Amino acid sequence: KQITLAHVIAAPIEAVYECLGVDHEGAIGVVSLTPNETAIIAADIAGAAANIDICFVDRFTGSVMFSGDIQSVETSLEDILEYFKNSLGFSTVPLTKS
Amino acid sequence: KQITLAHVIAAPIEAVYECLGVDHEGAIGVVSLTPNETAIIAADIAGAAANIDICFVDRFTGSVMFSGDIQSVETSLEDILEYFKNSLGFSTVPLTKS
Amino acid sequence: KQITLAHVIAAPIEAVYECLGVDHEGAIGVVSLTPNETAIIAADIAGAAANIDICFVDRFTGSVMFSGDIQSVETSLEDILEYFKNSLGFSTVPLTKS
Amino acid sequence: KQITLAHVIAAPIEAVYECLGVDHEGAIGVVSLTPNETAIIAADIAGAAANIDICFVDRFTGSVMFSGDIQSVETSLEDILEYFKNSLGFSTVPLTKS
Amino acid sequence: KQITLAHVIAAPIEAVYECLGVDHEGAIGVVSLTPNETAIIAADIAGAAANIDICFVDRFTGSVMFSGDIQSVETSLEDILEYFKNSLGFSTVPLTKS
Amino acid sequence: KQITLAHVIAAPIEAVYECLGVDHEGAIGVVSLTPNETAIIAADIAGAAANIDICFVDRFTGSVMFSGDIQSVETSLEDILEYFKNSLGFSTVPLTKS
Secondary structure (H helix, E strand, O other), rough: EEEEEEEEEEEOOOOHHHHHHHOOOOEEEEHHHHHHHHHHHHHHHHOOOOOOOOEEEEEOOOOEEEOOHHHHHHHOOOOOOHHHHHHHOOOEEEEOOO | OOOEEEEOOOOOOHHHHHHHOOOOOOOOEEEEEEOHHHHHHHHHHHHOOOOEEEEEEEOOOOOOEEEEOOHHHHHHHHHHHHHHOOOOOOOOHHHHOO | OEEEEEEOOOOOHHHHHHHHOOOOOOOEEEEEEHHHHHHHHHHHHOOOOOOOEEEEOOOOOOEEEEEEHHHHHHHHHHHHHHHHOOOOOOOEEEEOOO | EEEEEEEEEOOOOOHHHHOOOOOOOEEEEEEEEOOHHHHHHHHHHHHEEEOOEEEEEOOOOOOOEEEEEEHHHHHHHHHHHHHHHHHHOOOOOOEEEE | OOOEEEEEEOOOOOOHHHHHOOOOOOEEEEEEEEEEHHHHHHHHHOOOOOOEEEEEEEOOEEEEEEEOOHHHHHHHHHHHHHHHOOOOOOOOOEEEOO | OEEEEEEEEEOOHHHHHHHHHOOOOOOOEEEEEHHHHHHHHHHHEEEEEEEEEEEEEOOOOOEEEEEEOHHHHHHHHHHHHHHHOOOOOOOEOEEEOO
């Protein structure tokens, strides 16, 4: 049980927005974890902050992405890292910004 | 022989339901175990409570997911943990809620 | 976390330009990394040099391509390799030219 | 990083030419490699011998095809295998003739 | 590298002939292989027996079909299976009749 | 190699008949399989019961449809499922009625 990425893109670009198909507004939170199925649980905690929009949940690769105000995304990532670490006994990586 | 996840999502969201393709009603039980093939045996015990709906069984990764009323999912997970522990001699993780 | 390709094509040809659909001017930077989703983060750093044009970002295969003056592409690739190595703790391959 | 095919068809037929849409003259060099995006780099090296004509470059499947005199195609395939092996650290298959 | 189908239809029907657009005479050899591009190489070996007529070559799906006397089609399929197995190092399925 | 649909419509309607262009008499057998080209082989086995009429064979999508008495259509579907499973080593879905 590992979270290998819990990243936030503060200021994405047109090509990054167009790729995900979002409103060209806000940060993007990216998460990678193993086992791959737990992307469904991570997506749930990220989606609990109602202003966060789930971009895609891939249960095969273990990937989650979501958009919203920089602050909401950081809280969502922080919440995912905190729960998975303390409750689900995952070994989490530190949060990263670009 | 390990069950590394036996998790229930009590109140999933639109994006989580849409991802699995269910009726946007009920909890979701998630299970990870090794060896990976025994996802077929776990799915059988989860599917024995006839109101539980099997979402996907992955025998390559060792992943099972299923929907239904919060109570049915908990019983299904509890039954899987109890059988695999006592009968199949697995080392099980405690049941988790989100 | 691996960057397996960080390549620059200094002098591409008509068929290579026509394939990507660019202005038949400049070098092409090609990047492959795992996990595949981090193509979104690599594309962001490549797109930060405003004269670089993002050709395609594939989050499923982990592939990024972008065009612009040979010098801009090298800096973009160099920046991607430097950040992913130092910040995101990736194991990067050396930059390559054709 | 693998080149799984680097094949030359010395004497193709009407149906093979008509399928690719070439001048019904010369051999056809076929290349398959992973990652799939590096078909763009292989196409560049094949297209460097100016008498070779690029038929199609598929960056999604990792496929390159090109026509020209039997000798030009062999050199192009030989060059691709040599560069990818020595420079890009690919594990190449032997060249094949039909 | 896999040949998943190498099938012969000994006695096709009006609707099968009309679908392919052939002279309503002879067997039909059907071939599926991965990678998909090698349908071009399979078509070449099938077309080497000059009485065989190439129906379609799909390089995207990896599909080849061709008509002619039952004996010519069997030899063409047998030749494809033998070459791809021994030379191109494919894992071939047994030849099938309907 | 998968048969994903092997369905029979016992009592179709005017709009369904008019859509296919049949004599407004009998059931309709619908089949979906991958690879898509094997629709030609499925159509052959369905067309072997001479009272069955082939509606369309799509080798690109992998789709077959045919009309005739409810009993003939069931036998044709049953025969397709049995052959593809036992001979061609397909993983077949159960037959369905509407």
